[PDB]
Scaffold this motif. Structure first.
Motif, PDB file in Angstrom:
ATOM      1  N   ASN F  23       0.826  -1.199   0.000  1.00 46.07           N
ATOM      2  CA  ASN F  23       0.000   0.000   0.000  1.00 46.07           C
ATOM      3  C   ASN F  23       0.860   1.249   0.000  1.00 46.07           C
ATOM      4  OD1 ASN F  23      -1.970  -1.905   0.214  1.00 46.07           O
ATOM      5  ND2 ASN F  23      -3.022  -0.945   1.948  1.00 46.07           N
ATOM      6  N   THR F  26       2.627   1.680  -3.478  1.00 48.60           N
ATOM      7  CA  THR F  26       1.723   1.992  -4.575  1.00 48.60           C
ATOM      8  C   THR F  26       1.247   3.435  -4.544  1.00 48.60           C
ATOM      9  OG1 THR F  26       0.046   0.949  -3.201  1.00 48.60           O
ATOM     10  CG2 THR F  26       0.933  -0.321  -5.042  1.00 48.60           C
ATOM     11  N   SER F  31       2.392   1.339 -12.630  1.00 49.73           N
ATOM     12  CA  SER F  31       2.874   0.402 -13.645  1.00 49.73           C
ATOM     13  C   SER F  31       2.364   0.844 -15.013  1.00 49.73           C
ATOM     14  CB  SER F  31       2.435  -1.017 -13.314  1.00 49.73           C
ATOM     15  OG  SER F  31       2.709  -1.893 -14.391  1.00 49.73           O
ATOM     16  N   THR F  32       3.116   1.757 -15.616  1.00 52.97           N
ATOM     17  CA  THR F  32       2.747   2.236 -16.936  1.00 52.97           C
ATOM     18  C   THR F  32       3.936   2.126 -17.873  1.00 52.97           C
ATOM     19  OG1 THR F  32       3.237   4.502 -16.233  1.00 52.97           O
ATOM     20  CG2 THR F  32       0.959   3.761 -16.092  1.00 52.97           C
TER      21      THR F  32
ATOM     22  N   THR G  65       0.260  -4.454 -24.031  1.00 51.16           N
ATOM     23  CA  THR G  65       0.398  -4.359 -22.584  1.00 51.16           C
ATOM     24  C   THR G  65       0.893  -5.669 -21.991  1.00 51.16           C
ATOM     25  OG1 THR G  65      -1.481  -2.853 -22.680  1.00 51.16           O
ATOM     26  CG2 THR G  65      -0.745  -3.580 -20.512  1.00 51.16           C
ATOM     27  N   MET G  66       0.228  -6.774 -22.323  1.00 54.72           N
ATOM     28  CA  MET G  66       0.615  -8.054 -21.747  1.00 54.72           C
ATOM     29  C   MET G  66       2.032  -8.426 -22.144  1.00 54.72           C
ATOM     30  SD  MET G  66      -2.071  -8.053 -20.346  1.00 54.72           S
ATOM     31  CE  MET G  66      -1.697  -9.472 -19.321  1.00 54.72           C
ATOM     32  N   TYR G  69       4.581  -6.446 -19.991  1.00 53.38           N
ATOM     33  CA  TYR G  69       4.706  -6.973 -18.639  1.00 53.38           C
ATOM     34  C   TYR G  69       5.470  -8.285 -18.639  1.00 53.38           C
ATOM     35  CZ  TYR G  69       3.440  -8.887 -14.112  1.00 53.38           C
ATOM     36  OH  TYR G  69       3.473  -9.442 -12.855  1.00 53.38           O
TER      37      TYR G  69
ATOM     38  N   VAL H  24     -19.479  -0.679 -11.260  1.00 48.36           N
ATOM     39  CA  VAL H  24     -18.094  -1.080 -11.377  1.00 48.36           C
ATOM     40  C   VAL H  24     -17.490  -1.240  -9.991  1.00 48.36           C
ATOM     41  CG1 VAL H  24     -17.860   0.027 -13.601  1.00 48.36           C
ATOM     42  CG2 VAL H  24     -17.322   1.289 -11.533  1.00 48.36           C
ATOM     43  N   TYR H  26     -13.545  -0.904  -8.121  1.00 44.62           N
ATOM     44  CA  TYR H  26     -12.147  -0.557  -8.283  1.00 44.62           C
ATOM     45  C   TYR H  26     -11.261  -1.672  -7.741  1.00 44.62           C
ATOM     46  CZ  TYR H  26     -13.592   4.156  -9.517  1.00 44.62           C
ATOM     47  OH  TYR H  26     -14.158   5.239 -10.147  1.00 44.62           O
ATOM     48  N   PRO H  29      -5.368  -1.798  -4.069  1.00 43.50           N
ATOM     49  CA  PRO H  29      -3.942  -1.538  -4.310  1.00 43.50           C
ATOM     50  C   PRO H  29      -3.054  -2.720  -3.994  1.00 43.50           C
ATOM     51  CG  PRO H  29      -4.975   0.245  -3.070  1.00 43.50           C
ATOM     52  CD  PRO H  29      -5.935  -0.892  -3.061  1.00 43.50           C
ATOM     53  N   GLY H  33       0.719  -8.285  -9.961  1.00 41.20           N
ATOM     54  CA  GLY H  33       0.688  -9.207 -11.066  1.00 41.20           C
ATOM     55  C   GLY H  33       0.301  -8.524 -12.355  1.00 41.20           C
ATOM     56  N   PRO H  34       0.149  -9.308 -13.422  1.00 42.18           N
ATOM     57  CA  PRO H  34      -0.175  -8.708 -14.723  1.00 42.18           C
ATOM     58  C   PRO H  34      -1.451  -7.896 -14.700  1.00 42.18           C
ATOM     59  CG  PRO H  34      -0.637 -11.046 -14.727  1.00 42.18           C
ATOM     60  CD  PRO H  34       0.118 -10.776 -13.469  1.00 42.18           C
ATOM     61  N   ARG H  36      -2.619  -6.051 -12.306  1.00 40.89           N
ATOM     62  CA  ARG H  36      -2.271  -4.731 -11.800  1.00 40.89           C
ATOM     63  C   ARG H  36      -1.627  -3.891 -12.892  1.00 40.89           C
ATOM     64  NH1 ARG H  36      -3.599  -0.770  -8.948  1.00 40.89           N
ATOM     65  NH2 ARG H  36      -4.301  -2.406  -7.511  1.00 40.89           N
ATOM     66  N   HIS H  37      -0.711  -4.490 -13.651  1.00 47.38           N
ATOM     67  CA  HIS H  37      -0.086  -3.771 -14.753  1.00 47.38           C
ATOM     68  C   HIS H  37      -1.133  -3.297 -15.746  1.00 47.38           C
ATOM     69  CE1 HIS H  37       2.149  -2.760 -18.285  1.00 47.38           C
ATOM     70  NE2 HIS H  37       3.313  -3.068 -17.744  1.00 47.38           N
ATOM     71  N   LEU H  38      -2.046  -4.187 -16.127  1.00 48.26           N
ATOM     72  CA  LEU H  38      -3.088  -3.810 -17.070  1.00 48.26           C
ATOM     73  C   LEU H  38      -3.949  -2.695 -16.502  1.00 48.26           C
ATOM     74  CD1 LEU H  38      -4.465  -4.410 -19.759  1.00 48.26           C
ATOM     75  CD2 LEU H  38      -5.954  -5.980 -18.529  1.00 48.26           C
ATOM     76  N   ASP H  40      -3.239  -0.368 -14.234  1.00 48.42           N
ATOM     77  CA  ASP H  40      -2.554   0.917 -14.194  1.00 48.42           C
ATOM     78  C   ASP H  40      -2.447   1.525 -15.579  1.00 48.42           C
ATOM     79  OD1 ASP H  40      -2.278   0.458 -11.505  1.00 48.42           O
ATOM     80  OD2 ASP H  40      -0.207  -0.248 -11.657  1.00 48.42           O
ATOM     81  N   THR H  41      -2.107   0.709 -16.576  1.00 45.67           N
ATOM     82  CA  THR H  41      -1.924   1.228 -17.924  1.00 45.67           C
ATOM     83  C   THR H  41      -3.194   1.887 -18.433  1.00 45.67           C
ATOM     84  OG1 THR H  41      -0.162  -0.298 -18.546  1.00 45.67           O
ATOM     85  CG2 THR H  41      -1.558   0.578 -20.299  1.00 45.67           C
ATOM     86  N   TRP H  42      -4.316   1.176 -18.359  1.00 42.77           N
ATOM     87  CA  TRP H  42      -5.570   1.754 -18.821  1.00 42.77           C
ATOM     88  C   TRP H  42      -5.955   2.964 -17.986  1.00 42.77           C
ATOM     89  CZ3 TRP H  42      -8.773   0.844 -22.927  1.00 42.77           C
ATOM     90  CH2 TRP H  42      -8.440  -0.239 -23.739  1.00 42.77           C
ATOM     91  N   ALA H  44      -3.975   5.080 -16.450  1.00 44.03           N
ATOM     92  CA  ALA H  44      -3.140   6.209 -16.836  1.00 44.03           C
ATOM     93  C   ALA H  44      -3.632   6.823 -18.136  1.00 44.03           C
ATOM     94  CB  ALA H  44      -1.687   5.762 -16.969  1.00 44.03           C
ATOM     95  N   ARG H  47      -6.728   8.828 -17.564  1.00 44.95           N
ATOM     96  CA  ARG H  47      -6.414  10.134 -17.003  1.00 44.95           C
ATOM     97  C   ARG H  47      -6.048  11.118 -18.102  1.00 44.95           C
ATOM     98  NH1 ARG H  47      -2.759   7.533 -12.147  1.00 44.95           N
ATOM     99  NH2 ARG H  47      -4.493   7.187 -10.694  1.00 44.95           N
TER     100      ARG H  47
END
Lengths: 50, 49, 99, 99, 50, 50, 98, 49, 50, 49
Positions: F23, F26, F31-32, G65-66, G69, H24, H26, H29, H33-34, H36-38, H40-42, H44, H47
């Protein structure tokens, strides 16, 4: 049984070793529950013998 | 409003009014700091502001 | 020597679990100093080839976050682990072998 | 105040209930107490947003205190403190405890 | 557009931006080793590299 | 070593939980595709090892 | 759970609210093939429409994306060959994958 | 063709989501794993949009 | 404060702390090791500014 | 990670927990069999030598 009690002591027991904290929290709720205003109301004279 | 929109009040008896709408700077300072604590310090915090 | 065991860290009896022993342990000191050191490392002038200001602050925030979070592991090492080792050695079929 | 009273001589608060026993003083207990208070206020005054949260981010309210600062490349620091102002409820609670 | 930004390093970045283009006819000294007049100007983001 | 380690894990009161740590971290990282190489090792660190 | 409430949300979010509802419900297609005889019917499926280039964007985004990672996180943590690790590192999608 | 459904070898546990926002949920945090990566990317990209 | 071309006055970090360092015994440590840091930047375009 | 995430239980009484956990460990007899086997090892060694 506000804290430190749920998954640890039986329903019929109380935790003698966490007494001060539980007492304190109970008094806190007592305090918050009374934060009000003593508004007035209708007064009348008493026409009876009393 | 930087003294724009100048306005004033009437002059008469107002017996039982109560407007609890204010606080000290310390309260504001404390709240501001608290507000800064409950955010992710990355760009996500700044952008809405 | 007989009925004795050596230990990489200093050890002390088990105190009350208050705030001071939580953060005074040698292991905690090792962590605090180490992270403190790397912080001035990443902020050194030489990192400019890769680390812009935004990254520099970002890395800094990560390290300080790692340093600040509470953990009981150092306390366990310094005040509780030796007790567990001592008793276990007395019952395992193969006695400890140490230098 | 609540978190301090459960500790032993924490901060600089009065301790009228000190006669009562309180064995556990771990950070986990402090977090649970702080959550209890935070929920209580949110309920009593019907608050909506986050309030008093984030203090447990590192997970040890026993040393929670607010402060802000900024640093200059010349090595100078500011280190502004943000102590709380006087409070009425806190003083009221002491009278309740004493009674 | 330099002054309109809040970045403290913007003036140096502006200065180096021109210095990159003039590295051939007009050389100058760069303090910290490992950095040259043709280094991308946007990298000068540290008070110690001015 | 294996037997001793199993005994220790079975007998200690310590609990290992990388929740608060995740926490805290983060709140800083994301992760971008941008800012991934700087933090790749951190992601490896926080990856659930089982 | 202790402080539920209601707040406004922008139109974009309202679109998402409905869009998620539709996706969760799944697409409902109706087949009316002419080569077969008198056999039209309808049945739902989670299969994405993907009828033209408008779908290439979503799949290409997730595809990238995948893969990213996998290259930067999953593979180094899991592969065995040290030489492979040495060469697998210093590699990124923007100059190694399309 | 449409009678196929993907087989996930490690589904996202239900406890990995927050309370609903009407439809939906959320992502917590603490989840890595993958996915989480997915996420964050979307997020970002959203935003920026 | 807006500093201007003063190298020694460039503000490198804005910090905030959730806990009292004196309790941790961090009283003598670098401030960056004891306080959280803000990190946010916005890439504006010169052309629009001009 | 283990160094940095060291959570502990809520109602932790070291005396209770240790005694509860250590009690089964003394139900074994391996400690004695070890001694017996060592003794036999000695006699075997001496005679063999």
């Amino acid at each position: 049984k506000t804290v430190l009690s749920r998954g640890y002591i039986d329903n019929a027991q109380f935790n003698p070793l966490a007494l001060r904290s539980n007492v304190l929290l109970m008094l806190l709720q007592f305090t918050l529950s009374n934060l009000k205003i003593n508004k007035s109301s209708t007064f009348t004279s008493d026409v009876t013998t009393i | 409003a930087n003294n724009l929109l100048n306005s004033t009040i009437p002059i008469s008896l107002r017996p039982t009014i109560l407007c609890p709408w204010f606080a000290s700077s310390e309260d504001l300072r404390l709240q501001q700091v608290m507000h800064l604590v409950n955010i992710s310090s990355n760009t996500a915090a700044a952008l809405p502001l | 020597p007989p009925n004795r065991m050596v230990y990489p860290w200093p050890n002390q009896p088990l105190p009350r679990l208050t705030v001071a022993p939580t953060y005074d342990s040698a292991m905690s000191n090792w962590i605090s100093t180490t992270i403190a050191f790397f912080i001035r490392v990443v902020n050194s002038v030489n990192m400019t080839a890769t680390v812009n200001d935004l990254t520099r602050r970002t890395m800094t925030g990560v390290m300080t976050a790692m340093r600040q979070v509470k953990t009981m592991t150092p306390f366990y090492i310094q005040h509780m682990c030796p007790t567990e080792l001592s008793v276990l050695a007395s019952v395992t079929v193969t006695p400890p072998f140490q230098v | 105040s609540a978190v301090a009273q459960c500790q032993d001589a924490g901060f600089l608060v009065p301790r009228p209930l000190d006669a009562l026993r309180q064995f556990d003083v771990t950070s986990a207990a402090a977090a649970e107490i702080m959550h209890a208070v935070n929920d209580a206020f949110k309920t009593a005054f019907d608050l909506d947003g986050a309030l008093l949260d984030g203090l447990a981010l590192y997970g040890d309210p026993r040393i929670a205190d607010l402060s802000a600062a900024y640093l200059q490349y010349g090595g100078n620091v500011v280190r502004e403190h943000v102590p709380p102002g006087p409070s009425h409820i806190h003083r009221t609670l002491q009278q309740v405890e004493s009674t | 557009a330099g002054p309109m930004t809040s970045d403290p390093h913007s003036p140096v970045k502006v200065f180096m931006a021109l210095a990159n283009l003039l590295a051939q006819p007009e050389p100058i000294a760069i303090g910290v080793p490992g950095m040259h007049q043709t280094t991308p100007a946007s990298q000068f983001s540290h008070p110690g590299v001015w | 070593v294996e037997a001793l380690s199993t005994l220790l894990r079975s007998v200690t009161p310590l609990v290992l939980d990388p929740t608060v740590l995740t926490n805290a971290i983060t709140t800083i990282s994301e992760s971008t595709t941008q800012t991934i190489s700087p933090i790749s090792e951190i992601l490896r660190l926080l990856q659930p090892m089982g | 759970s202790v402080a539920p409430y209601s707040r406004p949300i922008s139109g974009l979010q309202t679109m998402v609210q409905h869009l998620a509802d539709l996706y969760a419900a799944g697409f409902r297609y109706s087949v009316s093939d002419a080569f077969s005889s008198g056999n039209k019917f309808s049945f739902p499926t989670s299969t994405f429409p993907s009828g033209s280039t408008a779908t290439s964007t979503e799949h290409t985004a997730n595809n990238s994306t995948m893969m990213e990672y996998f290259l930067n996180v999953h593979a180094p943590s899991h592969v065995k060959s040290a030489s492979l690790k040495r060469i697998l590192t210093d590699m990124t999608i923007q100059r190694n994958y399309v | 063709e449409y009678s196929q459904v993907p087989d996930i070898k490690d589904p996202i546990p239900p406890s990995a989501w927050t309370g609903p926002i009407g439809n939906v949920r959320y992502l917590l945090p603490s989840v890595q794993g993958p996915a989480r990566h997915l996420y964050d990317t979307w997020r970002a990209a959203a935003r920026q949009i | 404060p807006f500093t201007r071309l003063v190298q020694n006055d460039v503000i490198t970090n804005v910090l905030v702390a959730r806990v009292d360092p004196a309790q941790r015994g961090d009283a003598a440590v670098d401030i960056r090791a004891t306080h959280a840091t803000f990190a946010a930047a916005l890439p504006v375009d010169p052309a629009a500014i001009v | 990670v283990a160094m940095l995430c060291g959570q502990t239980e809520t109602n932790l009484i070291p005396s209770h927990h240790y005694g509860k956990a250590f009690a089964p460990l003394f139900a074994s007899n391996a400690m004695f069999t070890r001694n017996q086997r060592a003794v036999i090892t000695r006699e075997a060694f001496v005679c063999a030598r």
